[model samples]
Target: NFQKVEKIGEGTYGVVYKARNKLTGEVVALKKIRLDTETEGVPSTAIREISLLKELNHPNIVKLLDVIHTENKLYLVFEFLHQDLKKFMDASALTGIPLPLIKSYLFQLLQGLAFCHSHRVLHRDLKPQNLLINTEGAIKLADFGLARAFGVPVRVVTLWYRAPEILLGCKYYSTAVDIWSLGCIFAEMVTRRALFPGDSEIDQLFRIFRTLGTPDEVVWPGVTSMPDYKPSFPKWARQDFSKVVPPLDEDGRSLLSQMLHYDPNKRISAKAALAHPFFQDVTKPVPHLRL
Candidate 1:
């Protein structure tokens, strides 16, 4: 049986609730689908999410426990997570989630993403909200509604974390697109805010260049090959990474620098990122927290 305790959040497409399972005595989250008024029929995103979640299983990824279908509704069952980093950021508690902790979290995130990418899945939306932290201090990536399998003909991920190549209009994109998003997320975790919260696409591109000191042909060899590649803007010859995101420690900066590289080809692969020296400097495999 389903027992709804309280509403946790309400999004455009659905409402999430704190739920208790009657049979197993386990706590879970029940995300109820509320297809927009425009969606008078079954929501394709929800359907896709259900289909994808069924096949994916990993510790770092949120566990999709079950699915319940009732008349005119679909319910997704997920292991209950305490809250997300966005919430902690709002509360100014991200300081509690230190660089080492952030590194550990990123490691887990990369592990999960590497799995998805290996299986040819792309999480189109990779924001803080989609990542959940449990009581045991484990970070799990969730919400696969926008998740899709990528192949030869690739597309961009979400706007904020989108890679330059994707923004430059590359039709053929890949898991590398996701690596960029993870880099953005890593930077945000350290700063407790967006690395580049650009209001528009052009602005976003400018933001990336301004900090990383625009990618030159030598640094990003194949950048010009992008379908939408056009060097219309004035080239910024030089800039400093440390100055851009000044708050990060050396290791934190190292991770961000590699993750946010200009070229998708040069960007650190998710698996390689987890094994980077930056994470190695961190004390624990996971963050330490007071229980």
Candidate 2:
């Protein structure tokens, strides 16, 4: 059993609370599954995910500590890291997010992401807000309850973190989706603001196109066949990376380009990204980080 400490967060799926395991007094984030939908008390897709997620145990990913079906409902217990990467970044912004700091976070982020990627998993939601880092500087990938296994193509709750292929409604479950979001997170670290904070789905597509330039078949083969693709869409030339991310050096800029590539097939995998020269200068041990 757990004793509720206080409220922490809420989303479409459930409300989260800071709680303590009554037996050990360990604090944890308890995520409840909402079953109030009219058709039934549906525990839904995530119910099945729990079984699968248990197979994945990695340091860079959040720990799903336990699951409880109480007298009232379901509660999924997750390790309470005490901070979101967004909170960390916001806190650092008052002074300045040093370049090394950003690289380290990305490294740890990609470390967790790489494990999932290699195992045929896609952490569907990759955003600053979803990343967690403890006071010990241990960065972890969180909210992976939304992570999808290969072959289950299709879904997110952050418009800014959504991939261009997703906005175009390509029948997708590409690892590239995560890479695109990772690119946005990288840019946010450098700029302290989301790269493209669009108001609507169409607006998101336009924002991406205007910044990255509308891609032709040569750039992204078969993109014209996407469900949302429309030929009359206005064209916009790509802006120079320097113009947008002035702080990024050449290596980081090139890596960002690979992550943000127009072709999903060409997008860098988390494993490959970890090997990029951008991470060359940063190396060491951690608690496991300075995140």
Candidate 3:
């Protein structure tokens, strides 16, 4: 049984609500999907999400409790999450999040993403809004609408986290795609601002090149073969990253360096990231909640 409570947030597909399980008396999040003319099929992305989540389970990942299907309506039952990283970023409780706090989150994010990647799942969208931190600050990766089961060969990441190989139009890519997003997300988590807020596709690539330096066949080999590759930009010479994203510490910078690699093959894998030195000196306690 289910008892609807209050509204939570509007999803890209539909409205979400907070509810209570009548039999178990447990609070959960409810997502009600309404199909408009725009969604003519069974939203392949949504199908991909449920398929991946049904098997992928980790403490740092948001849990899909159950799903209710009837007629044209669909309801996704999920573990209740208190707040999103975006809300916590905007919260006034702290002026600037301490380094330890930042590391705690990054570690948790990597943990969840590592699990997804291990299972060949790509979390194409890894924005702060999709990362939920509960009341006790426990972090969980959510929102899999754009997520896909990779490794079988298909391009499914987004524009921001889109890898250089992807930007070059590689129809066949791997888990490295999510690694790029993890870097952007880690930077935003540290600074509470968009690391590479590229308005257009070209600008986005340039933004990446500006901080990490321009990419070429030598750097990102076979890049020229990409369907969307362009030879030029409003070329801005590379600048010192210390001056660009000033808040990142040595370890943080070290981590970002790996995630934002120019070559997809050379990009840091999630397992390697989990063993990074940044978490070596972490001091904050891991955030956990009743759920």
Give per-model TM-scores.
0.82, 0.91, 0.85
* TM-score, model 1 to reference: 0.82
lDDT of 1 by residue, 131-228 (tens): 88766667888764344421122233236777888788877677788888888887777666688887777888888887776777788887776666
Q: Largest TM-score belongs to which candidate?
A: 2
**Deviation in Å, model 2, residue 28 alpha carbon:** 0.3
Model 1 lDDT at residue 255: 72
Q: Which candidate, 2 or 3, would have the higher lDDT against the true structure?
A: 2
What's the lDDT for all of these models? 0.72, 0.79, 0.72
In terms of lDDT, which candidate is strongest? 2
Tens digit per residue, CA lDDT, model 2, 64-183 = 888665554667788888778777777877655788777888898888888987887787767787788777657888767454521122234558888888888876557788889989
